[PDB]
Design a protein around this ligand. Structure first.
Ligand SMILES: [Mg+2]
Ligand SMILES: [Mg+2]
Ligand SMILES: [Zn+2]
Lengths: 81, 246, 49
RNA sequence: UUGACCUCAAAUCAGGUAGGAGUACCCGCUGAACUUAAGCAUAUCAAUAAGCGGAGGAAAAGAAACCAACCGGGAUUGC
RNA sequence: UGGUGAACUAUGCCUGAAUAGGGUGAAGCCAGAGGAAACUCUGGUGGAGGCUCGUAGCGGUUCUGACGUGCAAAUCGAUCGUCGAAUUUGGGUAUAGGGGCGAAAGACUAAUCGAACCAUCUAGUAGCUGGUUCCUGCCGAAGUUUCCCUCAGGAUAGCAG
RNA sequence: GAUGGGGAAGCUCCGUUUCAAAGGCCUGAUUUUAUGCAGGCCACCAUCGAAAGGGAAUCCGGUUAAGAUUCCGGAACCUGG
RNA sequence: CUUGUGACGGCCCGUGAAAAUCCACAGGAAGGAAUAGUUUUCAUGCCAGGUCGUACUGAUAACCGCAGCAGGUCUCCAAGG
RNA sequence: GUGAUUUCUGCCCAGUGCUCUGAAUGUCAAAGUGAAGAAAUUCAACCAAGCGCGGGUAAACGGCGGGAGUACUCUCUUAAGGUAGCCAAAUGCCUCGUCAUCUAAUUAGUGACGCGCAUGAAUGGAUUAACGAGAUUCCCACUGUCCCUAUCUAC
RNA sequence: UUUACUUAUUCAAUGAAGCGGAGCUGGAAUUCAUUUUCCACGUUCUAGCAUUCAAGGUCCCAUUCGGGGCUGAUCCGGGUU
RNA sequence: GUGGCCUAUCGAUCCUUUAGUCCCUCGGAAUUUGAGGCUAGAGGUGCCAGAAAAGUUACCACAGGGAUAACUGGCUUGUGG
């Protein structure tokens, strides 16, 4: 009974939500996220996972400060009014 | 081939010793000043059972000579020690059972136990139940003592090493048959995960050197060289002789 | 090379202990046999004479 | 006793700086096998892919412990 | 090559929990009797055992029953093994892929195991199988020679344009 | 599972009291006063880990379409000050 | 009958957690009364008790098995013959 | 490794392993030493462990023969020749072995026999109470398994 | 090949507490002139107790509430053993 | 008369080595060792136009094959009847 009766015993999560990415990939016993690598300082990325890099790279979010850097450069980082 | 069972034992994943119900390391009192210039008197408060150990332990209380407090040491109980007995530890201690005299100050034929190898490691030799060390001879110049060990070997150790006079309590245990796989289960359940033992000749050849074949047989000789490597040392390692002698 | 070994592990052996070990190993029997063979060689020459 | 020197510390001491992201191109380390040899082990793939460390608008290299053998040339880079 | 899994399951640890009613009647003890003494006998008491019949529970022997495009990628029915322990089990925790764990079947490691899964190298290689897209006109074969780890393949000569 | 350390080219690995100068505790004293200087005491030595282990203290009656040992009425208890 | 508990008895080469936390004792540091104090482990009296969860199912239809699947999934209460 | 108890575990160290505190130039690396050379280099001596020589070890892996004569004995051969036990056994080709028993009839069962293709002693041998969803044979009871089929209910 | 030496290196313990040398004070000791040495150098019927820079002695201070130094508890070398 | 009366009686590249020329080269210039070349032999591939090479799989896998076995059918009928 490795199929249907064994699927009834599944009610204990191995992963919960992660703090940096909100992914539900944070392993409870390992205390590590399997997608972004929290709590390591570097973010988990691999050159074989180029599509995953495309999924989580810069520009897939809000860019709350980086949207204005090109415009401030074009104006020359001016000050005043 | 796979990694065999005795090869897997050294990682210590499930092969660590079960130490939940143990009462502390049974060591001798440290050799500070009193034990090497005079003696010191302590008291046996209680004799208790140690989990996974065949011998009982003794809880001996001394006074700290430098601070107002009490020290509690765990000795291995000698056969004949009772609760409320005064235990004397030191160079000038009188020769009675339970006392912790150094080996330079006991005569020929003395039976001691919990013997230090070097002066100060707080007990190494003859600690299992019913075992003892006999003093075979002295050597004052180049101050050493010869001792007979429980294995029958004769060691030559320092005369400043200490030992508890008498034999370890709880002797004669292995004379009783266990009679039951349940009894062996409860015996090893508090020691470590090394039981039950599957024979390697009953395995598959991926799992052991002895495994495989259309009959259960070893194949080559079971005596293994000392220069063999891990994964090969399964059998009788470096056997000088085999068989039942008559 | 042999001397190094004897010093390393067999230094603390009383002669009585050593003799027992040698008998168990079977080294003693070999020494005796070698000597016996030497005696045999001399005996053969005498027989020819 | 007092005052130096040397060395080593402590401060939510005064002021600073490093980490992470990106990584097409750049500077290094580490490092395969599929494949080809009509098999295969040196070889090849390849001083490559994957992995790790570190920069900039370029980086690196760069003003000879050079090339030459000629009636000698003259930093580096690229075609 | 680099990562992800012990939510199933294997094993150890830590902390909890669960297990009707019967049968047999072990030590210890009490009374009576006998004996010269050792000690024996009889009647009770007591309630031992990896004992036994048998529920809940755990498992899965047979019908090679049902079903077999099923209720179900392993179930249903009857018959069964076991049922106070080497028992069953929750949660926490540890062991990760030539590695783990195994009362040992090459078993189990998320329906995947005589080496898991994911992505990349990778459009891996194939003397082997299958396919290969409009018309008309003209010419029109070979299965033979020699060499090859050659015998389902090539080179070379021949035949053809 | 950090730190002190020690490996590792490195991502990181070991170790958890270790070859560390590892800290805070009460009385106060002073009443330019702030909290130093009077003192004296103590050496564990991060932290995480149980909604079934340990653990301060609440019960009854009534009430809603849907909440209650939590609201209402009454009657208690514990902790800190 | 279910359950709680007490005093016992049997078993073991099995003798069947730890820490936070609270109390007591030994000790005698120090502070202390006579026109006055010393005591808040006695009684009464005063103030405050933050944050998050709290509905419902828990299974032949609320979970997992592609589903409103005869499967699987821990536990408490338990009337009469 | 073997697998409760009882009773035993015979012979063989030649081979393959394992192991010696033996004896010591046979094999004999790098470094080092010596000679020749102008030097690169060449040639020798010396030379650690391990091999090689000498022992031990079978509850280590394993092994346990022939030909004659009259159970016995002789001869050859080997490391030593199967001991105690057991058997057409789950191990026997021939084989449906031979004898007895069980039946009307038995390639099945059981008890014996043993030149046993190719049984055999911790590769464990023989025996064995109790136990077994283990394999096999016979007997009593019992029955639609069958002679030989018929009928009824629910879906 | 044997054999010193310790500071490199290595192992172990401790909250780095009693190391080494010399000296007292006793005992043995035979001294052949005066001491050569060697052992000691506060604890053993009893499941109590042992802590407040220590009492005492002594010397200062400015007496008072007390405070400090030496000794009690032998010197010397800072090599934790 | 350019081996055996005739028809069989044998071997590439790379590497090593020998003989000859004592000839050519070691590329800044020479001498001498050393090395590399040219011409002709030898060391050998017997699977003989010339890979350096043990098994097992009843746990097995892939690409194919009726070019190829284990059934029936078909031809034949030795053998059988
Ligand atoms: Mg186990
Ligand atoms: Mg085998
Ligand atoms: Zn994350």
């Amino acid at each position: 009974g490795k199929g249907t009766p064994s699927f009834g015993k599944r009610h204990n999560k191995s992963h919960t939500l992660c703090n940096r990415c909100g992914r539900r990939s944070f392993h409870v016993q390992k205390k590590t996220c399997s997608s972004c690598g929290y709590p390591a300082a570097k973010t988990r990325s691999y050159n074989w996972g180029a599509k995953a890099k495309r999924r989580h790279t810069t520009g897939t979010g809000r860019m709350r400060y980086l949207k204005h850097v090109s415009r401030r450069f074009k104006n020359g980082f001016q000050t005043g009014s | 081939g796979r990694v065999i069972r005795n090869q897997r034992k050294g990682a210590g994943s499930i092969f660590t010793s079960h130490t939940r119900l143990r009462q502390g390391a049974a060591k001798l009192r440290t050799l500070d000043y009193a034990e090497r210039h005079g003696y010191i008197r302590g008291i046996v408060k209680q004799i208790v059972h140690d989990s996974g150990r065949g011998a009982p332990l003794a809880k001996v209380v001394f006074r700290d000579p430098y601070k107002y407090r009490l020290r509690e040491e765990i000795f291995i109980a000698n056969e004949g020690v009772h609760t409320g007995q005064f235990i004397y530890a030191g160079k000038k201690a009188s020769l009675n059972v339970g006392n912790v005299l150094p080996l330079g100050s006991v005569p020929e034929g003395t039976i001691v136990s919990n013997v230090e190898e070097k002066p100060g490691d707080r007990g190494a030799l003859a600690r299992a139940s019913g075992n003892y060390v006999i003093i075979i001879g002295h050597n004052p110049d180049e101050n050493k003592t010869r001792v007979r060990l429980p294995s029958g070997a004769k060691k030559v150790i320092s005369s400043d090493a200490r030992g508890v006079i008498g034999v370890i309590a709880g002797g004669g245990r292995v004379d009783k048959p266990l009679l039951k796989a349940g009894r062996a289960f409860h015996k090893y359940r508090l020691k470590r995960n090394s039981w039950p033992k599957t024979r390697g000749v009953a395995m598959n050849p991926v799992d052991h050197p002895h495994g495989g074949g259309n009959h259960q047989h070893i194949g080559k000789a079971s005596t293994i060289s000392r220069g063999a490597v891990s994964g090969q040392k399964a059998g009788l390692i470096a056997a000088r002789r085999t068989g039942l002698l008559r | 090379g042999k001397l190094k070994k004897i010093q390393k592990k067999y230094a603390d052996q009383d002669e009585t202990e050593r003799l027992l070990r040698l008998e168990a190993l079977g080294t003693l029997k070999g020494i005796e046999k070698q000597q016996q063979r030497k005696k045999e060689e001399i005996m053969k020459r005498e027989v020819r004479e």
